[PDB]
């Protein structure tokens, strides 16, 4: 329900020069995931693939992990745990790995780990960090968001932030970045609309 704490959202590139990257996908009607650099905001469709790129200047130590966590973007809602609405929580869309209440899933990684924090009650999802493939400059993780922003009983039209943290095997934070998310039926159109408020 309510958490007694709120995760920090402060960008931290750290010693390994950690940044996020996104595909430059544009805003055509078919696009299922598109990122606004001006808004630092991902627009994506429910349950579709959202590529998030990890960029580092140097290789993290062995055993490093990558955690994703959602919080409400507006400070007034930040103590409220981000979770799926009742409708989606009960629907039959289980992949056999993710808890039904969790908003954020990782796709295509059998080493995915999900956490219900016993103290803060927040949900998160973790994968081992892996260096880029040969000929590549970044590591891609495929996320899925399993509720719409408009889902009542869940996000209730409230914007969220995804916080990505790079975590080492001794408990230190190696890096952190974040981006706003809107999960919606028409990411391309919605991105143009929201960017129109600029200019």
């Amino acid at each position: 329900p309510l958490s007694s704490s709120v995760p920090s959202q402060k960008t931290y590139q750290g010693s390994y020069g950690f940044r996020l990257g996104f595909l430059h996908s544009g805003t055509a009607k078919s696009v299922t995931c598109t990122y606004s650099p001006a808004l630092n905001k991902m627009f994506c469709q429910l349950a579709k693939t959202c590529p998030v790129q990890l960029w580092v200047d140097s290789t993290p130590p062995p055993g490093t992990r990558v955690r994703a966590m959602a919080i409400y973007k507006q400070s007034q809602h930040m103590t409220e745990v981000v979770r799926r609405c009742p409708h989606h929580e009960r629907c039959s869309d289980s992949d056999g790995l993710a808890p039904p209440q969790h908003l954020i899933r990782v796709e295509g990684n059998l080493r995915v780990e999900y956490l219900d924090d016993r103290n803060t009650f927040r949900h998160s999802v973790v994968v081992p960090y892996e260096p880029p493939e040969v000929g590549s400059d970044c590591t891609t993780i495929h996320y899925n968001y399993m509720c719409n922003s408009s889902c009542m009983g869940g996000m209730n039209r409230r914007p969220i932030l995804t916080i990505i943290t790079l975590e080492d095997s001794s408990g230190n934070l190696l890096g952190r970045n974040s981006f706003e998310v809107r999960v919606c039926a028409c990411p391309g159109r919605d991105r143009r609309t929201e960017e129109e408020n600029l200019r």
Partner: nanobody
Amino acid sequence: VQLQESGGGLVQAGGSLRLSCAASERTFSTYAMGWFRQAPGREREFLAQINWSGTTTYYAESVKDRTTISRDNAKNTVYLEMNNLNADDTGIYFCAAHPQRGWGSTLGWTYWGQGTQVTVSS
């Protein structure tokens, strides 16, 4: 980077100790922290570790039942609480930061505090 412990001093037998450690710099909130103690004659001993966010903790088995480690990153401070103290709890208590050799080790810590004396007395 520059660690300071507080809360030491005389403690009644059966009472509890409440220590804290804070660093001056914003890099504190990215570091796991640890608490150690060293009794006269004996080697330095691991007590508890907590990760950068405070969500994850680990205790030495010998003190686990009556020890709590916590932190407040807003205030850049980590806390150690230990209950039901006895004579063998007397010693110098150290705060350390940025472990590089995993969980519950005495080696591999980048920063160390100067330590605070705790004396269990009747």
